[PDB]
């Protein structure tokens, strides 16, 4: 297969598992010495706010830092405009990213109303920002070696 | 203390990341120089945490201009001086020199031989720097050379075969100034 | 033209034919036997929704199960973060969907105000998911074989 | 590089230019005599909007007619659903566009307040409609030769 | 006032040239090195007419060593000392890099940015030859600087043959030492 | 280079080390998992004398079982009839070995006496047998992964 | 404890190597089985010094005929009768599948998982050679067989052979039959 | 595989044969049509000793011309300096050859005596001359057609 479109199912199955909350698959598409920087752009800045290390230290910040999901509600990472340039057994993916809140509203015991018709439910963003990605070649594809994540929100802790 | 290397394809955004990176944390500027065909090389040293932070600022502000981008942690402090500078200020009968084939391994196998014995490094050169062969000069005596020379080999053998290794116990003055120069 | 580029257009153009509610253009790019699985997905469930078979069965769902389009709305379905593997003669496409909302405001008789200056409307989103696509070959290029839909929101009928 | 991903690129660095309200960047991407004709388009139509040629007029068509970013706010033109056509040395490039507004909220002097957890502030979709680029061959790359825009929500000045 | 640039594919046959070009016409020499390998750069400076009359000379006296050659009329006399080596910049003020594709095209958008701006052109580089990478640096207040790096950015994509544009106000002690020096 | 070549240098390699009583370079030329399986081949049979396993113990068996030379001494691993077959990235290499020991004599005064013609010294041999090499492709070449050294006279310890 | 694997290319001297080892050392008989299309394969199984012996004797028997040889040893007692049989497994609990994609990996996965869980082995299996597709099956309570599946994922993993990892909590009736049977 | 190997290869499984007095693998390196020239040559001309002709009078010959070695006897064919030109799909390989004999001393008692090392026997040079070989090619692989062999020292037998 193509070297963009294995550098881009790389982003597509970060988004599943960022979404899943799935450790085990997040940690699967990096490098064993892998480092995710992530950074406070709000204001052209770049500010840290947390700088992991390994896959170790990638697995255990999906339990902490990502809210667990709960009864009926999911995310959907939307990445949008990537920009990728490959240079050998090297490359760089660029992308924006947005998190949406999905929250599933309680279905009644005897029945959604006769008047109601479309998605019961609630959808709102919360999350914005830009992934950069520095891939490696591997014998199996692509993975991922270094990522820094602007957000250009104010992340409170 | 850690190393982080950064490779860009044009001389005038190497310089403007020069600057970045220089003004996002307290690091150290090592190397900075052009290699043909244009393309240019960035060393910095210090903090690990420091280094990835100066490194995700270069990494992101590279654009298409980035070519390669490597962190090597937990360095021992006496190496950073061997880069862009000399440890000539010590004692004479320099002994031994490893050639490997990459500066990554070649920052590596040297950690590798600082813990084997008190053996001093004089320099670490290079050449093409992340792809050239560069080199490592070590000084000492005779039995603690050969197990640093070693150790520098199996460094680089683990991933590729170092491209020759020597001993030199007595330096003739004229290949003891080359060494040290 | 690449066999990625020409899955993702696959992709595209049944976006549009579905915000523009087109069932002749949307039947168009399925296969005579296809089958699109509505599936329910809220809680990592797979509850059947609705299970069509057929061009035909695909057409007369636009028409119906598609509320038509009125007024001055309009409709973007934003397809992130395709994931996609080609195994010779096939091939299969993953991507996330999010439904979104477009209601323009109606313009002054007189004009707008000297005050506002910018786009004067609504946009909210109001479904969201998952497609999952596999596509045979076809002398043009592909067509979609199977799909199945996994909304993580309550629908309701 | 591949052809397909060269184009995208241009489209994904359209819309980091978009948000970043850089009139350099993004006039560079054009052809010295290329065309944006942005269209009204709620309900099928194509009345004009703005029609600008060349460079220049697209340089000082970013000083106005898009707000200038101010205090801690910032833009995401989420572009979705590509289509392209590519026919020797020209293309043609399809795709949907959504505006969101990003605006960050104020941190306290003293910090965070102990009970809030998530990203703090406020994202909002203004705008959305479709692009639709013509494509020429250069030795670099791709770049614009002509462009459409058509807003589906009422544009006000 | 202009500049004729004479790539030999001969190091013996050019440095004939460079005795027969300064011979013949009341001429400069700004540089004249090897370019790797097995190749030779000379350029000159001054009178246009006394250019073409040395550039004529020298094509012909060539023979098959010739490999391109190129006369870049009416400069500015200031950008003559910044390709033969550095103007002393006291001031610290700011820096402005453009890096072009060609070495006739960085000339020509140095003599732009000259002409156009109060700046004080540092250095005109070239690591390869007349078709290499080259890179022109000026030092100045942050208005002239941004102007400078404006108008420089135009004769260069003009042509089609701009590799990066940058401006750094208030450059690290670390970049100012180099760009500069 | 000849793959057969390769194999053959390091067999070449192997006696001059052997001779040279160089344990870093005899392990050099063993995979980190290599176990060499010396045993008594008088009469045909197989009993096993020694069962190295590793760089480890093929470095302390230099250290061991074989002596460093003493003042005007040294030996010649003498191998022949080599027979190799290569099955793609592995190979097994068969030869015959023979070990002749070696001993100068000392020029009595100032030199040898008037009439002396030759070499002076004492040339024996000792051990005799049957190398079975069995090789596995590395980046760099080859390297030996399993050894089996048969010893048609008993030895001693 | 320790399991030869010797990949012949003939099946008469497969048959011959196979008397030959076992009449030169305490090993047993694990598997003998022709791999298509005219290929043997032999494992071994027993005491590591036993099977570095048998694995010397087959190795220089056979001639041209040997195409590939590997010793994994120590590995648990348990992990034999996996290998040439099933393990009866009376309870239904839950069952964990394991896919690798070497024989090697698989063994040393299964291995990893038994010593580090109280899980059952049921059966190793190898539709092609030592390098074909292989999955191990384990059967226990789901707390055993989710740790039993994550220490086997990493040791195949490690060396970057894993295919897919599954545990299924209460298999039915129509897949119990068939992965324990 | 090379051919020059594969030539290496039938001389090595010469000398192993000879060793090993293996009468059905002599043979089976042979044509059914070979024939091999023993001849004496102590200071030069070609003085025939032996004409054996045919793939039968090759087995027999073991079974005659070579004594079997007995109890902890055995022989090392050392064949050395090889020079092969192939030619077309005729070759000629010309080595010189050298046979030691090879006796086991037995062990005494429960042991050698204290401090014994190396190996225990008797390794004596018997036999010199040159080889001279003429294959042709066999559908998979080369077969012997004709051998010449000269001997530096007169047989007795």
């Known amino acids: ?157 | 203390q850690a190393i982080g290397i950064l490779e860009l394809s044009s001389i005038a955004k190497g310089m403007e990341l020069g600057d970045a990176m220089l003004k996002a944390a307290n690091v150290d500027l090592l190397v900075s120089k052009t290699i043909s065909p244009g393309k240019f090389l960035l060393m910095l040293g210090g903090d690990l945490d420091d280094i990835i932070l100066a490194v995700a600022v270069g990494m992101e502000r590279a654009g298409d201009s980035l070519l390669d981008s490597e962190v090597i942690p937990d360095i021992h402090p006496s190496v950073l001086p061997a880069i862009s500078g000399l440890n000539s200020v010590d004692k004479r009968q320099a002994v031994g020199i490893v050639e490997t084939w990459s500066v990554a391994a070649c920052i590596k196998a040297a950690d590798r031989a600082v813990k084997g014995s008190n053996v001093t490094l004089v320099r670490v050169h290079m050449a093409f720097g992340i792809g050239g062969k560069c080199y490592m000069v070590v000084a000492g005596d005779v039995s603690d050379v050969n197990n640093a020379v070693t150790v520098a080999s199996e460094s680089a053998g683990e991933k590729g075969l170092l491209v020759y290794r020597s001993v030199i116990p007595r330096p003739h003055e004229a290949m003891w100034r080359q060494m040290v120069e």
């Open chain 1, 1 to 157: 297969m193509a070297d963009e479109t294995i550098i881009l199912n790389v982003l597509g199955q970060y988004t599943r598992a960022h979404d899943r909350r799935d450790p085990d698959a997040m940690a699967a598409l990096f490098a064993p010495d892998a480092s995710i920087v992530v950074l406070d752009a709000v204001g052209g800045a770049s500010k840290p706010i947390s700088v992991l290390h390994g896959r170790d230290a990638i697995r255990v910040a999906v339990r902490q830092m990502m809210a667990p999901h709960g009864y009926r509600a999911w995310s959907q990472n939307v990445v949008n405009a990537p920009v990728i340039h490959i240079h050998g057994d090297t490359a760089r993916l660029d992308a924006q990213f947005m998190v949406f809140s999905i929250l599933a509203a309680e279905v009644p015991d005897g029945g959604w109303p006769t008047g109601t018709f479309g998605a019961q439910g609630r959808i709102v963003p919360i999350e914005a920002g830009t992934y950069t990605l520095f891939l490696r070649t591997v014998p199996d594809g692509w993975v991922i070696a270094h990522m820094v994540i602007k957000h250009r929100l104010p992340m409170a802790f």
